[PDB]
Amino acid sequence: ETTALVCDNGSGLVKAGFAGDDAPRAVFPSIVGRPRHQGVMVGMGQKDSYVGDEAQSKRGILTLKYPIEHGIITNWDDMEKIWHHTFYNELRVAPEEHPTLLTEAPLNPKANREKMTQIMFETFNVPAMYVAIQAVLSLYASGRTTGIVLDSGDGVTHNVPIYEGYALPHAIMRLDLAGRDLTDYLMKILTERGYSFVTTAEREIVRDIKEKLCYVALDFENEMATAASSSSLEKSYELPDGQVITIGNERFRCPETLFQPSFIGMESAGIHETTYNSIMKCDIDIRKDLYANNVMSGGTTMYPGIADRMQKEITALAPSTMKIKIIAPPERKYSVWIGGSILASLSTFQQMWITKQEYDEAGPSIVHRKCF
Amino acid sequence: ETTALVCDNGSGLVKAGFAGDDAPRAVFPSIVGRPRHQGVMVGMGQKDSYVGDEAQSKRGILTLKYPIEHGIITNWDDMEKIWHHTFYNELRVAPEEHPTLLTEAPLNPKANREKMTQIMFETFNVPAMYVAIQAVLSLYASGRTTGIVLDSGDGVTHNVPIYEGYALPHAIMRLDLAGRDLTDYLMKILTERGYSFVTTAEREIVRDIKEKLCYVALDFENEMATAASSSSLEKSYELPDGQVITIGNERFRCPETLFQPSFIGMESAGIHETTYNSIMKCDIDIRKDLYANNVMSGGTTMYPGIADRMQKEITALAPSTMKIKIIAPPERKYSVWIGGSILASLSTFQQMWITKQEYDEAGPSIVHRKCF
Amino acid sequence: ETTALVCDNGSGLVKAGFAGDDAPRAVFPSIVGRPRHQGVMVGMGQKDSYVGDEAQSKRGILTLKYPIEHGIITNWDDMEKIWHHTFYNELRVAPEEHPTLLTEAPLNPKANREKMTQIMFETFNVPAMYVAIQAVLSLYASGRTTGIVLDSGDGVTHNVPIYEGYALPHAIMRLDLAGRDLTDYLMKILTERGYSFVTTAEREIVRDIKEKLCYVALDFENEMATAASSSSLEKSYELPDGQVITIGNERFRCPETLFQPSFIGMESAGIHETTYNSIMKCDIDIRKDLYANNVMSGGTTMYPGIADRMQKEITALAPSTMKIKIIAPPERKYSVWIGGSILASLSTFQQMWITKQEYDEAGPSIVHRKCF
Amino acid sequence: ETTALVCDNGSGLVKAGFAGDDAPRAVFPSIVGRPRHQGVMVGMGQKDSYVGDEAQSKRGILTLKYPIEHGIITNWDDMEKIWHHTFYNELRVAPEEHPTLLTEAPLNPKANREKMTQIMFETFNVPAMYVAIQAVLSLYASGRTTGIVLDSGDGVTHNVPIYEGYALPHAIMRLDLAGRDLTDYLMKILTERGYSFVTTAEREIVRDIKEKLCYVALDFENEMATAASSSSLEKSYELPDGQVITIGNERFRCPETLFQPSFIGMESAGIHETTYNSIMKCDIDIRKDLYANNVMSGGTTMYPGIADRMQKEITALAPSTMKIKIIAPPERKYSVWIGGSILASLSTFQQMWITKQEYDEAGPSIVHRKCF
């Protein structure tokens, strides 16, 4: 009993490590694959399920499926299987040796935090566990206690305003347009170039196109009229089969969906008017200290030039007599885990766990009252 | 009950032996001969049928006929007769002593695998038998689990892609241009030299011309224009009657039919565009690992310089940023049997037989569900 | 200038006629044939290309090729040749006399609609033309403005939800399993009966087997176990050479691929879970009016008993408190053209053309903004 | 330069005439005779070689020899001598006045068409010449462009399928059982009556027996059992020396060799299974139009009742749901020349000659590329 596990179960990518380190020892996607062909070799019951890095190598013959949809775990027969791969096959530690700090998104169903709690005790038998909130932990990474958290992950995007210690739950604006629904819009606009990426194996190619050749336009129409002279923007990507694709104005139209959700047909507003409408529901005296502290996190805020368009477009919405400072640390991808490393290494937290003894006599409703 | 028979009934040449050896103990062609003349000696009912090595010695007075057409057994009164010659007269073992591993081509009719099964139990009374696939067994010989199998035998040629354990049945491209239909094109282009090889006895001479003086051109037109100066290429063959033939540009035009099936008038493409079109129907993530593993087998890939023209012409079709590696072992003629020796000598296979007891209560549809 | 041409260039069968009629005056397949043999008669340069009904009569000596793959035109040297056969040799009208209403599939590449537009002006010099969408025009035939369109043609199958005027482009689920890829599965399951249909000339025989003896099972396993007593289902077809085939359980396994795309190995779902997953991405208030309006069209919805299995299997997926009404008109094969006859005969459309004058000053990007 | 010569050099009988006529002006056998006795008169060097009609009158003292064996010219010192008799002594025209249309059998050696070409220019100095194929020219006589040609001449018999313009070279079934090898079987079955016809002078008597008293049985065994009551079939022939022969069942057993090549010991099948096996190698879509067009030609199809047994025995081999129509014109002996008269009298052919000027700069390989 020395250190604690921090198993950030993201909606698209599991991050796990130890309390204290500044880099997780387990980065692999939340993929549980099933083979779908015949299998004529002598390995009949040989590796019926591939999890994580296994199902990323062998993905041409596997029916991949993300077990987590918008932060809501849909398949408990598979999310147990990633955790069994997480502790034994990748971290190589016993679950019974160390406590665990699980993370989840805010506004999740109340049956979701309980079913995570039921598994970590009745299956893995951990000593103690605490389920934090992913938007709280972005402050501990940046070293603040004040700000609003644009936590655009892979399954969900949600602004959470937090003033000096005190979170404001009546102003969380959740949005279900995230990195998984940008891939599905990118596969719909690569069809107009002729390239047909359809199945789940090609879905992991388009996600790799999105992480390499896709930026955010500062102004959208003037980058659109630049694509009329289609020579200075068409970058080329080299597929796993050796083919090439000449992708042009699809470089910037796929992350513009974060600012124009009418492209994929969502009746809401982008991440510049769900931040501005989450500050205009806070109190007027703390409205000045939230403009100067705009913490971003998540994978979907790793695009080139997303801190420019946030600062350019909130300023068009804010009253123009004071400043907007988008605070984007250059390692903000892992920032939910980095704050999870710090908070599990404090002194004022080692009494805030939930032990097995406390879980017995108080039941699974002891986890919802733990700081909401 | 110690070892197992592996009776590879090829479409033109029966290979039989024991499980464990690296060379079959029975190599003789699938020929059942009938005499066609009068027979004035006292041997009236003396040896009315000659099978295999018998009908290769006495072939001047016999009406030879292959019982197997394109892998499909056409005459069950003769294919029983080769097997009765196989077990007793050549292997000299009882059929009831050892199990049997029969091989057959993929995409054969479903009545063909059943009628082989009916004979091996109700006539020879073997303990157990398993009908494998000839394209699977080329991997066990080469020691791989990944690749596409150019299995150009004597009756049929078929590319079968197999990734790491899992075969892809929706991409098998079968082709009925094989070594038997190259003999019939060679007898049609020896007519233009004047030499008339017509009957079935001379058909076994032309097959012996094809196995000795016929190579594959690397480039076809530049070897054709070389034949204008007709002195440096005309090799001579010495017939069984002592005659000679001065064969020239017919050295390379008969195996060019494997790459130009429009010579014998087939509306398909050669073995370079049925391999390339069998990879372009596989999934895109396994398309890279099939280019680097091109297993060849069968007798018709024993020509001089066939690994050159495959590697030279798939490369003209593949995207030119990555490599093609034609894997041609120097004993690939027997490679269907060599893999049959290994697979019958495993530990994870000795439960995968089909016994007589299991065949009784489950009927002849128990053999089609056995790994397709 | 009285009427308009409606040239529905299908992926497998060209339909052309006049605006106003209820039956097209030109039904012939999209086939451009090249002869592949010697041609020893005096007709040396005599009819080097046969198009449509010509290449259906003489198909034994022709290398037929469909110019259109999945709605995407692959060979512009041949698609011009069908149109030159369409206007002059079959409709017998000048192209310069009447405007033209071309149709195409949704989610086609943006270079495909432009290259059709470039040919109809710069080669045939038509007065005006409009490129509609084939899924829109299925509503005008059925006389509705509300519904989802199962447009299972020959090259492509795509559900398009359309509410009262307003199409929903963020819910089109395209699928590349159509009538051409059912023929290729039927030629792979006639091999297990022994019958080898391989070349392109026999491909037009198997397509004629599919249109006559192939129905859809209501329940699949109970029609499969019916084939164990193989006497009451084996229908016979009489080939062009006078042979017969006794086809059994291949009557219903070839259109079951429309509901089980894992048979030909596609990692997607059938046309019952791409309709249900295209309604579950529409808004919840219009989800009730799409269940009661399920327009089918295309050739591949002409099977016996396809309206039964759609209504039987969406009902297993829908919430079971309200109704599903599959609307299948008994002439739904030509329904893309029937709606094209009506829409070219309206009053509110005769200003929605694209003239040659408007095409000059605005360029080929004037056709993509025309109602998407 | 008005008309053209058509010198059909048959394997047993030279036919020559002019382009336009419906009957050749030169019918005489291909016989070059040498005298073999002493010659005691004063005519020492008097007529050392007799050609054609000369060596048919004086044949009792001449060693006759056919210069052509199975279409292959064996003695160029004699085939020049027939042509020198053909142009000057029988047609009485200069060779330099008119072009020439030579005919030959298909599948002849490539040295045979060149050596004919070398003689017609470098010895006779004709203006232009074209070497056609004898099986093509049977269609022009019958006025068709579709059918299979049973061209049973004197040296060779070969089925050639020809569809609408386009010949199919991969289905020509050549057979070396023809009218010359029926004479040699007739001289072997007249020995059992006692009559010994042995030398070449008596060989021209047996050929005259075959052309007068030999028919084809419709059913063979029932005409054989009719010969048990040997009174109603034994016809009598009157020899040149005044003797008579009472020939019985040898009337029909000598042309039965055309349907039973095992009588003279050939390992092949008759002219009913080399026509049926030459249609079963054609494509399946043209297999119906070859059954209804069975053109016969050549001298060996002049027997009484050969159109009956072809139509009676292909029908036993064909699928019995459609018809067989043996098309036998009543002048089919000269039909190779009749088609040669028409094709040399066309307008689309007078550019398809091969002049002396074109032969100089292009060499003797210009004749093989001329429509194969």
Ligand SMILES: Nc1ncnc2c1ncn2[C@@H]1O[C@H](COP(=O)(O)OP(=O)(O)O)[C@@H](O)[C@H]1O
């Ligand atoms: N460098 C990048 N640029 C753009 N998008 C990225 C990048 N890296 C990851 N992403 C997107 O973000 C997702 C990963 O975000 P992450 O924060 O790991 O999700 P989660 O909230 O589930 O942990 C990926 O699915 C990918 O689509």
Ligand SMILES: Nc1ncnc2c1ncn2[C@@H]1O[C@H](COP(=O)(O)OP(=O)(O)O)[C@@H](O)[C@H]1O
């Ligand atoms: N050395 C050789 N070179 C070229 N071709 C060969 C050679 N040996 C055999 N063949 C051809 O390969 C055929 C034998 O192939 P094989 O693999 O025995 O066929 P099967 O699949 O029926 O066993 C023979 O008919 C012959 O035409």
Ligand SMILES: Nc1ncnc2c1ncn2[C@@H]1O[C@H](COP(=O)(O)OP(=O)(O)O)[C@@H](O)[C@H]1O
């Ligand atoms: N009666 C039928 N039953 C089943 N399938 C049919 C029938 N008629 C046509 N088909 C299939 O539908 C295809 C024709 O569809 P069609 O509507 O012409 O496609 P498109 O017009 O989109 O190219 C044919 O290729 C055939 O496979």
Ligand SMILES: Nc1ncnc2c1ncn2[C@@H]1O[C@H](COP(=O)(O)OP(=O)(O)O)[C@@H](O)[C@H]1O
């Ligand atoms: N009336 C006849 N009946 C049967 N056979 C005949 C008849 N006339 C000729 N023949 C045979 O046909 C041969 C002539 O065939 P022909 O077509 O002249 O040969 P080629 O094809 O070499 O010109 C003769 O050798 C003779 O044996």
Ligand SMILES: [Mg+2]
């Ligand atoms: Mg995350």
Ligand SMILES: [Mg+2]
């Ligand atoms: Mg083999």
Ligand SMILES: [Mg+2]
């Ligand atoms: Mg259509």
Ligand SMILES: [Mg+2]
């Ligand atoms: Mg002739």
